[PDB]
Design a protein around this ligand. Structure first.
Ligand SMILES: O=C1Cc2cc(C(=O)N[C@H]3C[C@H]4CC[C@@H](C3)N4S(=O)(=O)N3CCC(NCc4ccccc4)CC3)c(Cl)cc2N1
Ligand SMILES: C[S@@+](CC[C@H](N)C(=O)[O-])C[C@H]1O[C@@H](n2cnc3c(N)ncnc32)[C@H](O)[C@@H]1O
Ligand SMILES: [Zn+2]
Ligand SMILES: [Zn+2]
Ligand SMILES: [Zn+2]
Length: 423
């Protein structure tokens, strides 16, 4: 019994809107991907199927590229892995761009698979391609991806008959660039990339009324505000820790539109995001490219060493409300968590709390997770008043953003029961 419907918007293509009134935290839609895969940096670190980290993964012996937490996941992934296996084998030791592997899985799913539930409201066929808006160098990039695909698929796909009817590879890559979801794990690390075509109906806002959250590859779409019958549903395509200029560029480059929202009109919060010595935060911005690369490959010790040279720099420092400092602090926290340095993690974690309160207003899944992490760190150092405060806060946010259908909630519920014992 669906609470949402596709409709044609006035000036931003198709969209999704409420059929009934919606309360904050209400579950609107849930979906497995049409197709999905591990990100290049998380390959060999998380299970290809369920996208969880394990220190020891089993590999597919044919290709030795697909790896798995367990026999269960490896056997169940086989149907959707079969045909890419060969392609991946012959490609070695060089690995295709994530978008190519993803499209491969799309083409196999469409050709070999039953009709997907992910396409109930909107199919891959319907996805926006923005073809008449692409720049020539973006076009050039798509043509390279098309030829990369043909090379990668030379064995499994020789001609048009093995693609769907009237399938155009250029058009399909155009779809993939602006309809690919970055799948994040429970701790909000980017772990994979997928297509969820029904979810791709939702248009963008820098102040959205809905939210999406991932439980492995399974995506949950929830309302994070009150929403009236006939009102457009929106999610934020972007990281909240971006300036309007940074949002402008990515929404142009990747999604081919100009955002007309209040926040973009007023440069909302931009000034506060860029406080401190300009010179210092440009070096830190520079350095974050390297830091974020190390983090995507889970190289925690190096992430932390780089972060500590900024946070505890002998030279001039930034305020924690500065978004580049903030990012550096979050990376540091997470590095310390995974290296088992729980004291240092907590120092950093606590310092992110006020800026997150400001930058993730209402109910945002990323703040809820950050608060849980800080609450969790406190709990396991004996700070039971403070910990209980944050865990209840995390629950207040995540009951809206995650909901009882997400298993991280059950983990928090147990943490709440536990911390409740002391009092
Ligand atoms: O048709 C489509 C295709 C598509 C893609 C996306 C999408 O993938 N968005 C990204 C993933 C998530 C959700 C929004 C934003 C960008 N992120 S995030 O920022 O919430 N996310 C990824 C980055 C993480 N880390 C932030 C960080 C970076 C660097 C240092 C410290 C922290 C936190 C979780 C979204 Cl939201 C909608 C959508 N509709
Ligand atoms: C994932 S889709 C959203 C659904 C899309 N509108 C459609 O018709 O299929 C992304 C595309 O929708 C359009 N879009 C999304 N949010 C928008 C906004 N706030 N303003 C204008 N266009 C937007 C852009 O063309 C963008 O590339
Ligand atoms: Zn698994
Ligand atoms: Zn294989
Ligand atoms: Zn905007």
């Amino acid at each position: 019994p669906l609470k949402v419907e596709k409709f044609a918007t006035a000036n931003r293509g198709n969209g999704l809107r409420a059929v009934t009134p919606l309360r904050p935290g209400e579950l609107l839609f849930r979906s497995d991907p049409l197709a999905y895969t591990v990100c290049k940096g998380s390959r060999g670190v998380v299970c290809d199927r369920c996208l969880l980290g394990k220190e020891k993964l089993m590999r597919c012996s044919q290709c030795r590229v697909a790896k798995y937490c367990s026999a269960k996941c490896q056997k169940k992934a086989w149907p959707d892995h079969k045909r890419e296996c060969k392609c991946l084998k012959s490609c070695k030791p060089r690995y295709p761009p994530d978008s190519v592997r993803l499209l491969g899985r799309v083409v196999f799913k469409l050709m070999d698979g039953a009709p997907s539930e992910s396409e109930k409201l909107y199919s891959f066929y319907d996805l926006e391609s923005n073809i008449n808006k692409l720049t020539e160098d973006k076009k050039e990039g798509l043509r390279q991806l098309v030829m990369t695909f043909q090379h990668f698929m030379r064995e499994e796909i020789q001609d048009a008959s093995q693609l769907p009817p009237a399938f155009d590879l250029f058009e399909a890559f155009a779809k993939v660039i602006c309809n690919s979801f970055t799948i994040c794990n429970a701790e909000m690390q980017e772990v994979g990339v997928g297509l969820y075509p029904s979810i791709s109906l939702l248009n963008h806002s820098c102040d959205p009324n809905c939210s999406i959250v991932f439980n492995g590859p399974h995506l949950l779409l929830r309302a994070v505000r009150d929403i009236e019958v006939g009102e457009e549903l929106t999610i934020c395509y972007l990281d909240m820790l971006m300036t309007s200029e940074e949002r402008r560029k990515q929404l142009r480059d990747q999604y081919c539109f100009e955002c007309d929202c209040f926040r973009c009109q007023t440069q909302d919060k931009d000034a506060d995001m860029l406080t401190g010595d300009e010179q210092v935060w440009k070096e830190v911005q520079e350095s974050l490219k390297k830091i974020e690369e190390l983090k995507a490959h889970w190289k925690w010790e190096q992430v932390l060493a780089m972060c500590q040279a900024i946070i505890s720099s002998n030279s001039e420092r930034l305020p924690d409300i500065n978004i580049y400092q903030l990012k550096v602090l979050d990376c540091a926290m997470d590095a310390c968590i995974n290296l088992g340095l729980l004291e240092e993690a907590l120092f950093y974690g606590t310092r992110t709390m006020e800026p997150y309160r400001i930058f993730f207003p209402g109910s945002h899944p990323v703040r809820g997770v950050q608060v849980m992490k800080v609450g969790k760190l406190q709990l396991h150092q004996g700070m039971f008043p403070q910990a209980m405060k944050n865990l209840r806060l995390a629950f207040d946010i995540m009951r809206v953003t995650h909901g009882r259908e997400h298993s991280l909630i059950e983990d928090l519920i147990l943490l709440l029961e536990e911390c409740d014992a002391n009092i």
